[PDB]
């Protein structure tokens, strides 16, 4: 039958005071109720709408009833998003330790659309659910309807939102730049956010993090081992329960050269700490009272957290198996490489601990590799766990750095907390890179119509013009600055711990005050060293400036026929063959020289000049570890440890600590309760 409008029309000007711009579709008048197929729909009704072929029936809430100026009978509704209607999509079928997506759990949005009454099918009972009500007072309510929603979804930044100490667990902690930045920003916002625990399977990163944070319980192990260790630390906290012992040092689950199970490190009486030995529990069965003492005092000291002891969990799971740099990735199935599954392990630990806040960080290819399968996976794991969630992309250089590192950050917050915003850029940046089209709405940036005057985009000279000269072989971990800081960025990066609100060493100046740390470049072998020596000190100089190199047709390198193959002192060619082959012979990166006025898009774990522009502008060496950490905002006092390559890996895998610092300020504002409203973006105060 024909759909009809029911009841007297709304007052002419009342409808304009309610719907002004409706008077790009214009309306003759407005109504309140409408019948289609012998069922009356009033305003505010939740409605099922016919969709395309193979498309599920849309879900909407009616906002107007009006006849269009084209004599049509229109209705308009704002849509409910299914869990698969959001950016999650195919990963709506995943489950994390029990929790699954409820098929009856939709998400209200402010996205509106006008259609005709003929698109309407049947009513649907959708109840609004408060998570902060009695937990069993939500059950019968959910089973007394058809669909339910406890959260709103926003396309902007994929926001799932509701309608003073704090502990932080740093999973895959590395050297600790991300957790350090979070703590610094939270201290600026007025929150005592510390780092109580840190897990990383690389030993030198643990060394660095514990050096810069002595009170942090840094564990040199894997994340799955740590999760099983938490599981089998809980039951000892519940039970309280050849030689002789004096005390037990530590506890662990599994590990290298060991089988699954709980092990204790033992100090034997009459023997030194060098004779302390890792032992299983079935062989420590004759040592009950000392295990009781260990468990009791470690529980009182919170050496390991129980469910509820972690307020924030931050993570930087490995991107080596997701990055576009890895030309061996498996797009067909991403959860085959173990380094990709470490994100699943991370979210499993999040499920076990249930922290108030979650902050996962990765690179942009997590939203592109396997069409973003892993990234959305993360979001799904948060949505299936009833977490408020948010997804953003933040450029490092926009927060005071001479580098363009766009990173994806996943915020998560329990419904009892306030979902934290993303900090707007405080700096302009040299745009070097492209954001995905499917996540254009997740770029943390000012819109084009309004952008205040931001501080000038930092260049490389602003970061390294301060540092004194060093040679290819610089074996000194600690040295002195050749002079005073030149630029504002260098003055900020040379600030002490207390000037940067770093309370790791309490009051009083900590170690290495005013010293130049890790100002050591990668020591190239003699061949690469003299290859670098042959590169001219000019802007744009690279291997194409070496002897015997020519640029042929279509910017393709060739050999010079008139010049014989230039040979080094060792009997190996001056110009390597891979330099001639790279990027179908069209690359300027091999043995590239960077200059003071041109930025570095992304500092990486490897510092060889071979396939990147990493040679110092005026010195015959690659950029030092301290210079790369400066490009990523590490304060000069943050000392690294390990071999030179390992320190490079540490600063290249880290998070730019200005980025983490802005995130920490936003997190502190959300944690304390100081928030404006629905805006996912936040303008930072002077800092």
């Amino acid at each position: 039958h024909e759909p009809e409008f029911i009841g007297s029309p709304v007052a002419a000007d009342e409808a304009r005071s309610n719907w002004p711009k409706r008077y790009e579709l214009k309306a003759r008048c407005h109504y309140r109720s409408a019948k289609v197929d012998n069922v009356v729909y009033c305003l505010g009704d939740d409605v099922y709408v016919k969709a395309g072929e193979n498309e599920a029936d849309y879900i909407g809430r009616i906002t107007e009833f009006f006849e269009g100026t084209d004599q049509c009978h229109y209705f308009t509704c704002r849509w409910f998003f299914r869990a698969e209607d959001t950016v999650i999509n195919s990963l709506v079928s995943i489950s994390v330790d029990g929790h699954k997506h409820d098929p009856r759990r939709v998400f209200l949005s402010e996205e509106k659309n006008d259609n005709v009454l003929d698109c309407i099918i049947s009513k649907v009972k959708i109840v609004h659910v408060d998570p902060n009500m009695d937990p069993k007072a939500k059950a019968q309510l959910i089973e007394s309807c058809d669909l339910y929603y406890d959260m709103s979804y926003s396309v902007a930044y994929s926001t799932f939102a509701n309608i003073r100490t704090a502990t932080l667990l740093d999973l895959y902690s590395g050297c600790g730049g991300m957790s350090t930045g979070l703590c610094l920003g939270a201290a600026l916002s007025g929150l005592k956010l510390e780092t109580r625990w840190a897990v990383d399977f690389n030993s030198f990163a643990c060394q660095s993090l514990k050096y810069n944070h002595p009170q942090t319980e840094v564990r040199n192990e894997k994340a799955d081992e740590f999760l099983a260790l938490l599981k089998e630390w809980a039951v000892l906290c519940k039970k309280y329960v050849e030689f002789v012992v004096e005390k037990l040092v530590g506890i662990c689950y599994g590990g290298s050269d060991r089988e699954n199970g709980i092990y204790f490190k033992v100090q034997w009486e009459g023997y030194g700490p060098e004779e302390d030995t890792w032992e299983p529990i079935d062989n420590l069965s004759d040592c009950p009272q000392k295990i009781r003492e260990f468990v009791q005092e470690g529980h009182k000291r919170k050496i390991l957290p129980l469910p509820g002891d972690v307020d924030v969990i931050c993570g930087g799971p490995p991107c080596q198996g997701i990055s576009g740099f890895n030309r061996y990735r498996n797009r067909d199935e991403p959860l085959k490489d173990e380094k990709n599954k470490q994100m699943v392990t991370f979210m499993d630990i999040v499920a076990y601990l249930k922290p108030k806040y979650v902050l996962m960080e990765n690179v942009v290819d997590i939203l592109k590799f396997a069409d973003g399968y892993l990234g959305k996976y993360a979001l799904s794991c948060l949505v299936a766990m009833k977490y408020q969630a948010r997804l953003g992309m933040m450029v490092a250089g926009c927060y005071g750095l001479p580098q363009f590192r766009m990173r994806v950050f996943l915020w998560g917050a329990l419904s009892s907390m306030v979902l934290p915003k993303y900090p707007l850029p405080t700096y302009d940046v040299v745009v070097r890179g492209g954001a995905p089209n499917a996540f254009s709405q997740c770029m943390v940036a000012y819109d084009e119509t309004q952008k205040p005057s931001l501080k000038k985009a930092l260049l490389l000279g602003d970061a390294i013009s301060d540092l004194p000269k060093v040679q290819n072989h610089q074996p000194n971990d600690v040295m002195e600055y050749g002079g005073s800081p030149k630029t504002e960025f260098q003055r900020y990066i040379r600030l002490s711990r207390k000037d940067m609100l770093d309370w790791s060493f309490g009051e009083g100046a900590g170690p290495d005050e005013g010293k130049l740390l890790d100002h050591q470049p990668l020591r190239l072998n003699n061949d690469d060293y003299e290859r670098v020596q042959q590169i001219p000190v000019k802007k744009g100089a690279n291997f194409r400036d070496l002897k015997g190199v020519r640029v042929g047709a279509n910017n393709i390198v060739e050999w010079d026929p008139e010049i014989e193959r230039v040979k080094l002192s060792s009997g190996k060619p001056l110009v390597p063959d891979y330099a001639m082959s790279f990027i179908k012979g069209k690359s300027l990166k091999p043995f590239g020289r960077l200059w003071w006025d041109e930025t570095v898009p992304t500092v990486v774990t490897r510092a060889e000049p071979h396939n990147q522009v990493i040679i110092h502008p005026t010195q015959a060496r690659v950029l030092t570890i301290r210079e790369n950490a400066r490009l990523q905002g590490f304060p000069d006092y943050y000392r690294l440890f390990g071999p030179i390559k390992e320190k490079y890996i540490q600063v290249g895998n880290a998070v730019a600590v200005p980025v983490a610092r802005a995130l920490g300020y936003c997190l502190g504002q959300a944690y304390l309760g100081e928030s404006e409203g629905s805006d996912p973006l936040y303008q930072l105060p002077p800092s």
Binding site: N113, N115, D118, C119, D447
Partner: peptide, 17 residues
């Protein structure tokens, strides 16, 4: 009956544009 339909400011990271 028939099917219904279900339907973005640019950002600026640089100094200009």
């Amino acid at each position: 009956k028939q099917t219904a339909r279900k339907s973005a400011p640019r950002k600026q990271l640089a100094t200009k544009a």
